[PDB]
Design an enzyme around this catalytic site. Structure first.
Site, mmCIF file in Angstrom:
data_model
loop_
_atom_site.group_PDB
_atom_site.id
_atom_site.type_symbol
_atom_site.label_atom_id
_atom_site.label_comp_id
_atom_site.label_asym_id
_atom_site.label_seq_id
_atom_site.Cartn_x
_atom_site.Cartn_y
_atom_site.Cartn_z
ATOM 1 N N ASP A 139 0.742 -1.191 0.055
ATOM 2 C CA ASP A 139 -0.376 0.310 -0.065
ATOM 3 C C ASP A 139 0.985 1.025 0.135
ATOM 4 O O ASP A 139 0.728 2.410 0.368
ATOM 5 C CB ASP A 139 -1.066 -0.243 1.427
ATOM 6 C CG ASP A 139 0.031 -0.899 3.134
ATOM 7 O OD1 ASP A 139 0.965 0.190 2.527
ATOM 8 O OD2 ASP A 139 -0.385 -0.696 3.179
ATOM 9 N N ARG A 164 0.309 6.210 -0.580
ATOM 10 C CA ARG A 164 -0.112 5.562 0.591
ATOM 11 C C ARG A 164 -1.331 4.942 -0.500
ATOM 12 O O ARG A 164 -2.156 5.969 -0.153
ATOM 13 C CB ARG A 164 -0.420 5.471 1.922
ATOM 14 C CG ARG A 164 -0.432 4.890 2.212
ATOM 15 C CD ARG A 164 0.561 3.840 3.120
ATOM 16 N NE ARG A 164 -0.199 3.158 4.498
ATOM 17 C CZ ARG A 164 0.702 2.150 5.533
ATOM 18 N NH1 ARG A 164 1.680 2.760 6.007
ATOM 19 N NH2 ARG A 164 0.122 1.327 5.682
ATOM 20 N N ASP A 186 -5.696 -1.500 5.035
ATOM 21 C CA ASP A 186 -4.146 -1.612 5.749
ATOM 22 C C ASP A 186 -3.549 -2.438 5.592
ATOM 23 O O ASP A 186 -3.688 -3.685 6.380
ATOM 24 C CB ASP A 186 -4.056 -1.026 7.080
ATOM 25 C CG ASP A 186 -3.210 -1.251 8.267
ATOM 26 O OD1 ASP A 186 -3.472 -2.184 8.723
ATOM 27 O OD2 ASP A 186 -2.375 -0.766 8.329
ATOM 28 N N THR A 187 -2.021 -2.875 5.270
ATOM 29 C CA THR A 187 -1.578 -3.942 5.459
ATOM 30 C C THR A 187 -0.902 -4.523 6.728
ATOM 31 O O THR A 187 -0.665 -3.981 7.151
ATOM 32 C CB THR A 187 -0.404 -4.200 4.082
ATOM 33 O OG1 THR A 187 0.806 -3.305 4.282
ATOM 34 C CG2 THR A 187 -0.755 -3.853 2.783
ATOM 35 N N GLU A 239 1.219 -6.734 6.944
ATOM 36 C CA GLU A 239 3.068 -6.666 6.768
ATOM 37 C C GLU A 239 3.732 -5.255 6.947
ATOM 38 O O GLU A 239 4.591 -5.270 7.451
ATOM 39 C CB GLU A 239 3.107 -6.695 5.231
ATOM 40 C CG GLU A 239 4.472 -7.439 5.247
ATOM 41 C CD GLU A 239 5.223 -8.262 5.026
ATOM 42 O OE1 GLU A 239 4.939 -9.392 6.355
ATOM 43 O OE2 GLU A 239 6.293 -8.516 4.197
ATOM 44 N N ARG A 286 3.158 12.677 2.967
ATOM 45 C CA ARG A 286 2.972 11.524 2.196
ATOM 46 C C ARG A 286 1.348 11.915 1.180
ATOM 47 O O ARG A 286 0.339 12.492 1.643
ATOM 48 C CB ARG A 286 2.033 10.477 2.611
ATOM 49 C CG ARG A 286 3.325 10.011 3.302
ATOM 50 C CD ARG A 286 3.048 8.250 4.421
ATOM 51 N NE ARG A 286 2.118 7.488 4.849
ATOM 52 C CZ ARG A 286 1.789 7.720 5.788
ATOM 53 N NH1 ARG A 286 2.803 7.668 6.653
ATOM 54 N NH2 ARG A 286 1.034 8.397 6.262
HETATM 55 C C1 LIG Z 1 -4.400 7.105 5.440
HETATM 56 C C2 LIG Z 1 -4.749 8.639 6.805
HETATM 57 C C3 LIG Z 1 -4.079 8.446 7.926
HETATM 58 N N1 LIG Z 1 -3.895 9.307 9.080
HETATM 59 C C4 LIG Z 1 -3.260 8.892 9.828
HETATM 60 C C5 LIG Z 1 -2.686 7.858 11.177
HETATM 61 C C6 LIG Z 1 -1.519 7.075 10.764
HETATM 62 O O1 LIG Z 1 -0.609 7.232 12.257
HETATM 63 P P1 LIG Z 1 0.447 6.904 12.455
HETATM 64 O O2 LIG Z 1 2.038 7.986 11.571
HETATM 65 O O3 LIG Z 1 0.943 7.498 13.974
HETATM 66 O O4 LIG Z 1 0.740 6.159 12.613
HETATM 67 C C7 LIG Z 1 -0.674 7.278 9.347
HETATM 68 C C8 LIG Z 1 -1.027 6.059 9.400
HETATM 69 O O5 LIG Z 1 -0.486 6.688 7.384
HETATM 70 P P2 LIG Z 1 -0.274 5.403 6.676
HETATM 71 O O6 LIG Z 1 -1.271 4.077 6.219
HETATM 72 O O7 LIG Z 1 0.746 6.012 5.336
HETATM 73 O O8 LIG Z 1 0.934 4.609 7.206
HETATM 74 O O9 LIG Z 1 -1.318 8.234 8.910
HETATM 75 C C9 LIG Z 1 -4.923 9.454 9.321
HETATM 76 O O10 LIG Z 1 -4.865 9.935 9.865
HETATM 77 N N2 LIG Z 1 -6.190 9.481 7.949
HETATM 78 C C10 LIG Z 1 -5.672 8.790 6.944
HETATM 79 O O11 LIG Z 1 -6.411 9.253 6.237
#
Ligand SMILES: Cc1cn([C@H]2C[C@H](OP(=O)(O)O)[C@@H](COP(=O)(O)O)O2)c(=O)[nH]c1=O
Length: 149
Positions: A21, A35, A40-41, A43, A87
């Site tokens: 992802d 992403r 949410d994978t 792995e 991202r």
């Molecule tokens: C995709 C997404 C992620 N996030 C936050 C939660 C996660 O915080 P943390 O970084 O503290 O884990 C992170 C996960 O993104 P990723 O899936 O790109 O890793 O982005 C949101 O708040 N809203 C969203 O729609």
């Protein structure tokens, strides 16, 4: 009569896919990391979450996927354009196939991360998730016998 599509789809370049992802592509001369949204994978172990116990080869999935994708596109939603990490968030496609629904269709990534208004495709993704659940593919290898809501 006239061509009609959905949202704004823009072309991109396959620089180097990292996980299932997550893949780095080029945009108007700008190499960023995108992403998959609403997925949410298991792995991917970025956060303290870690892999439950099904760490599959998602990275490989998107590996040959975009590698053979004759055309890689990206569709930004109407919500924000990036996350707190910068991202880029957008549903990726390839040859006319939704990569997000692809992994969820093979029962590899679990739907999650829902923060309106960034979920335009929440019913379409949830649909592919229901099919991967009845097919019991990978993560869905539970013993659904009695069943119960
Ligand atoms: C995709 C997404 C992620 N996030 C936050 C939660 C996660 O915080 P943390 O970084 O503290 O884990 C992170 C996960 O993104 P990723 O899936 O790109 O890793 O982005 C949101 O708040 N809203 C969203 O729609």
């Amino acid at each position: 009569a006239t061509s009609t599509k959905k949202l704004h789809k823009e072309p991109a370049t396959l620089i180097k896919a990292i996980d299932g992802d997550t893949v780095k592509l080029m945009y108007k001369g700008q190499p960023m990391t995108f992403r998959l949204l609403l997925v949410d994978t298991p792995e991917t172990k970025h956060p303290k979450k870690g892999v439950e116990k099904y760490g599959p080869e998602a990275s490989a999935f998107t590996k040959k996927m975009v590698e053979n994708a004759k055309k890689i596109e990206v569709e930004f939603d109407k919500g924000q354009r990036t996350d707190k990490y910068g991202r880029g968030l957008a549903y990726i496609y390839a040859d006319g196939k939704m990569v997000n629904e692809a992994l969820v269709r093979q029962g590899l990534a679990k739907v999650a991360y829902v923060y309106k208004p960034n979920n335009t495709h929440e019913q379409l993704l949830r649909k592919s998730e229901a099919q991967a659940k009845k097919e019991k593919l990978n993560i869905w290898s539970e013993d659904n016998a009695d069943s119960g809501q």
